[PDB]
Design an enzyme around this catalytic site. Structure first.
Site, PDB file in Angstrom:
ATOM      1  N   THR A 164       0.684  -1.035  -0.033  1.00  0.00           N
ATOM      2  CA  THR A 164       0.031  -0.192  -0.165  1.00  0.00           C
ATOM      3  C   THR A 164       0.883   0.894  -0.015  1.00  0.00           C
ATOM      4  OG1 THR A 164      -1.818  -0.650   0.949  1.00  0.00           O
ATOM      5  CG2 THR A 164      -2.105   1.147   1.212  1.00  0.00           C
TER       6      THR A 164
ATOM      7  N   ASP B 178       0.927  -5.623  -4.415  1.00  0.00           N
ATOM      8  CA  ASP B 178       0.096  -6.600  -2.957  1.00  0.00           C
ATOM      9  C   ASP B 178       0.888  -7.568  -1.884  1.00  0.00           C
ATOM     10  OD1 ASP B 178      -2.315  -7.030  -1.691  1.00  0.00           O
ATOM     11  OD2 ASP B 178      -2.814  -5.443  -2.133  1.00  0.00           O
ATOM     12  N   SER B 179       1.016  -7.266  -1.186  1.00  0.00           N
ATOM     13  CA  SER B 179       1.864  -8.235  -0.321  1.00  0.00           C
ATOM     14  C   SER B 179       0.600  -9.367   0.477  1.00  0.00           C
ATOM     15  CB  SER B 179       2.162  -8.078   1.338  1.00  0.00           C
ATOM     16  OG  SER B 179       1.057  -7.043   1.968  1.00  0.00           O
TER      17      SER B 179
ATOM     18  N   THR C  60       1.924  -4.523   4.253  1.00  0.00           N
ATOM     19  CA  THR C  60       0.926  -4.507   5.720  1.00  0.00           C
ATOM     20  C   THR C  60       0.373  -6.161   5.659  1.00  0.00           C
ATOM     21  OG1 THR C  60      -0.878  -3.551   5.920  1.00  0.00           O
ATOM     22  CG2 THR C  60       1.000  -2.501   6.426  1.00  0.00           C
ATOM     23  N   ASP C  61      -0.297  -7.119   5.122  1.00  0.00           N
ATOM     24  CA  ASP C  61      -0.686  -8.195   5.113  1.00  0.00           C
ATOM     25  C   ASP C  61       0.384  -9.100   4.862  1.00  0.00           C
ATOM     26  OD1 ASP C  61      -3.737  -6.679   4.627  1.00  0.00           O
ATOM     27  OD2 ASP C  61      -3.343  -7.229   2.619  1.00  0.00           O
TER      28      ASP C  61
ATOM     29  N   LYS D 247       0.482  -8.249  12.622  1.00  0.00           N
ATOM     30  CA  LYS D 247      -0.697  -7.452  12.317  1.00  0.00           C
ATOM     31  C   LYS D 247      -2.289  -7.218  12.910  1.00  0.00           C
ATOM     32  CE  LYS D 247      -3.149  -4.819   8.662  1.00  0.00           C
ATOM     33  NZ  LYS D 247      -3.108  -4.719   6.747  1.00  0.00           N
TER      34      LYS D 247
ATOM     35  N   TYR E   3      -3.252 -28.315  30.976  1.00  0.00           N
ATOM     36  CA  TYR E   3      -3.919 -28.929  31.387  1.00  0.00           C
ATOM     37  C   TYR E   3      -4.431 -30.248  30.662  1.00  0.00           C
ATOM     38  CZ  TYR E   3      -6.721 -24.697  32.084  1.00  0.00           C
ATOM     39  OH  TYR E   3      -7.164 -23.360  32.304  1.00  0.00           O
TER      40      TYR E   3
END
EC number: 3.5.1.1
Lengths: 328, 328
Positions: B11, B53-54, B85-86, B156, B274
Site C-alpha cells: 500500500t 500487493d503483499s 502490511t498484509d 498485524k 491441562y
C-alpha cells in the site's frame, strides 16, 4: 428477585479431593467457596447441567445449554452460566443466535484460576455476573473482571492473563463497581417474544490463508465440509499469484458459503478496499464485516442449519441479528 | 553512511489507476513523495525487487528478498525494505530464519495509507525505519509508527488503525523520536559471520480448532500437506469428545509435524497446564510456546526445508534461533 446459576464445567469448577480425584465442583460449592449467597433479597438457585473442560464443548452442547436457559425464562429474573474460558465466546455467540429477545439478563462467566486457588479471579467474576444478572438488562452477556460485554462481541485474547476477554470492534456494555452497574453502552433490546431457534449445521471449517497454502489443501477442505471461514490478511482478499487460491474459491463458492474474516484482532474486513478483495467478492465470497471470529463461525453454523440457499446465507450473514455486526 | 531501500510493493507504493489501486510506485518515488533524502550525512540508494500487493507474497519471494538483502551486506551500512502490511510479519519472520547474524540493521516497513494520501502514515514510518537503519544496531526489525520491533515478534493486529503492528509476548526494541533512537530492549546480537540459509518447504497449513471441526476435514488436510499448525484454545489442547480430533492428530504426528499455537493474541501455549494439553503432547504435538503465528508458520517451513526427521523438527521448533521463542 430469583436468579439461576447454571453450572457447565470449566476451570472455575476444578478441584482435587483429599485422595487425588479431580472433581468439577457444583454451582452451589462454587458460590459457597466464593463467599456468595449467605443472605436474601435475591434468592439464588443452582443447577448443574454439564461438567466439561470447555475445549471439549461441541455445538450439540449449545442446544443443551440453550434449552436450559430458555426454559428458565418462566421462573427467573436473571441467569448466570459458569463455563470454561476456552470456548466461552463461542457459546456466548451461539446462544445469541439461538435465543432471540431474551426477557432477562443471561450472563456467562468463568475464571482463569480454579475457585479452590487462593488468589482466584472466580469470586470477582461471579460477583460481576450476579450483580448484572440482578440489576442489568435483557440480553446475552459475558462477565469478566469488572466488565460486562455483549456475548456476540467477545473474544478470548489472552491465554494467561486475568484480563482475558475483550470486547472487539464494539464498546463494553457496563462495568460493575461494588454493587453498582455503570452503563457504558445499552444495546437495542428487542421488544418481541422470546424465541428458541436451535438449528445449526456444525460442519464448518475455519482456515487461515497463509503464504504457501496450496490449491490442493483448500480443495480437500472444501469437499469435506459444508461451509468455510477463511481468515485473510488485513481488509481481506485472496492470493491468486503462483498458488491460485482464487480459482479454488470461485468453484467452491458456487456450491458452499465461503466467508472471509481477518487475521487482525481489530477492525474486521472490507473487501471493497483493494483489488484482491474485489476479486474475492466477484468469486462469491461473503464478508464477515467487523464480526468476531467466534461470532462469524457460530452465525454461519446457524445459517446453514436454516438453509442451503447461498443467497439467503449471504443475507443472514450480513444482517445484524443480535449486535454481532455493524450495519450501514 | 550508505543506506539501501529495497522496494517490494504494498500500500505504501500504491497509486490509483484506471483499474483501481496498484502497487506501482518505485522505492525512489516513495522516498520523493515522503520528502526524504534532503540531508547530507547518509547517501540513500534504491533498488526495486517486486511490485506486489503483499497478499500475493509467496514463500519463493522470501528467497528473492533475502538474496537481495544478503548481497547488500557488502556495500551498505543499513537496509530498509518497503513492503505491504498484509504479510509484513510473515516476511520479517521468514528473513530472520533465512539470514543469520545480519551485520547491519535491516528494517521492514509499510503503511496503512498510500503515500499519495494527505494524512498518510508512510512518511513517519519511513523516517522511523531510516533513522534506525542509520543509528540502530544489527538484526531484522519492523518499523511502524515510532516503533522498532523484533521481526520475529510482530503481528498485524489491526486491519484499519494506524498502530497496526504490535510486538507480541516480547518488548518493543526502540522508539524513534525525531532523529533519536531511545532503546527499550537490546536483543542478543550474534557475533558470528553472516549466513544465508534459504531452504524452506512451503507446503504447510494453518487451521483453527473449532467446535464442529470434524476428523474427516483434519484427515483431508493432513494428506495434502507436509506440516500443520493448529490454532487451539487458550493454553492449548485438542478436542477428543464427540469429534475425536486427538485420534486424527496422533496418527498424523507419526508422519508429519503438528504444531500447536493459540487463538489468543497474547500469552502463547502451555500444553502442560491441562489434561487436554497433556493428551496433545502424548500424541506427538509440538508446542509453539509463546511464538507469534507468523513466526510459527515460517519457522516450520524453514524446519521442513532442512529435514523430514520429526525429532529434529521438534528440536528446531523449540530452540530459540532469532528471538522468536522464550527459552527452556
Amino acid at each position: 428477585m430469583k436468579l439461576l446459576v447454571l453450572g457447565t464445567g470449566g476451570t472455575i469448577a476444578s478441584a482435587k479431593t483429599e485422595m487425588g480425584y479431580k472433581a468439577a465442583l457444583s454451582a452451589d460449592d462454587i458460590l459457597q467457596l466464593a463467599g456468595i449467597r449467605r443472605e436474601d433479597g435475591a434468592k439464588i438457585e443452582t443447577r448443574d447441567i454439564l461438567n466439561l473442560d470447555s475445549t471439549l464443548i461441541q455445538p450439540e452442547d449449545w442446544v443443551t445449554i440453550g434449552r436450559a436457559v430458555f426454559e428458565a425464562f418462566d421462573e427467573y429474573d436473571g441467569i448466570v452460566i459458569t463455563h470454561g474460558t476456552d470456548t466461552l465466546a463461542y457459546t456466548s455467540s451461539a446462544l445469541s443466535f439461538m435465543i432471540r429477545n431474551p426477557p432477562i439478563p443471561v450472563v456467562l462467566t468463568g475464571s482463569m484460576l480454579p475457585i479452590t486457588e487462593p488468589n482466584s479471579d472466580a469470586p470477582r467474576n461471579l460477583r460481576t455476573a450476579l450483580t448484572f444478572a440482578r440489576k442489568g438488562f435483557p440480553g446475552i452477556y459475558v462477565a469478566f473482571m469488572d466488565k460486562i460485554m455483549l456475548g456476540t462481541r467477545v473474544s478470548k485474547v489472552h491465554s494467561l492473563g486475568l484480563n482475558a476477554f475483550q470486547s472487539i470492534n464494539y464498546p463494553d456494555i457496563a462495568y460493575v463497581k461494588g454493587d453498582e452497574v455503570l452503563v457504558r453502552h445499552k444495546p437495542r433490546i428487542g421488544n418481541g417474544e422470546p424465541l428458541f431457534d436451535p438449528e445449526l449445521d456444525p460442519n464448518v471449517v475455519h482456515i487461515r490463508l497463509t503464504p504457501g497454502l496450496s490449491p490442493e489443501v483448500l480443495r480437500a477442505v472444501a469437499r469435506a465440509t459444508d461451509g468455510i471461514v477463511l481468515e485473510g490478511y488485513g481488509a481481506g482478499g485472496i492470493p491468486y499469484r503462483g498458488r491460485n487460491l482464487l480459482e479454488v474459491v470461485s468453484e467452491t463458492a458456487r456450491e458452499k458459503p465461503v466467508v472471509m474474516t481477518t487475521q487482525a484482532l481489530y477492525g474486521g474486513v472490507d473487501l471493497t478496499r483493494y483489488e484482491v478483495g474485489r476479486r474475492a467478492l466477484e468469486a462469491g465470497v461473503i464478508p464477515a464485516g467487523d464480526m468476531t471470529k467466534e461470532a462469524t463461525l457460530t452465525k454461519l453454523m446457524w445459517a446453514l442449519g436454516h438453509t442451503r440457499d447461498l443467497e439467503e446465507i449471504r443475507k443472514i450473514m450480513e444482517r445484524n441479528i443480535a449486535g454481532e455486526i455493524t450495519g450501514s
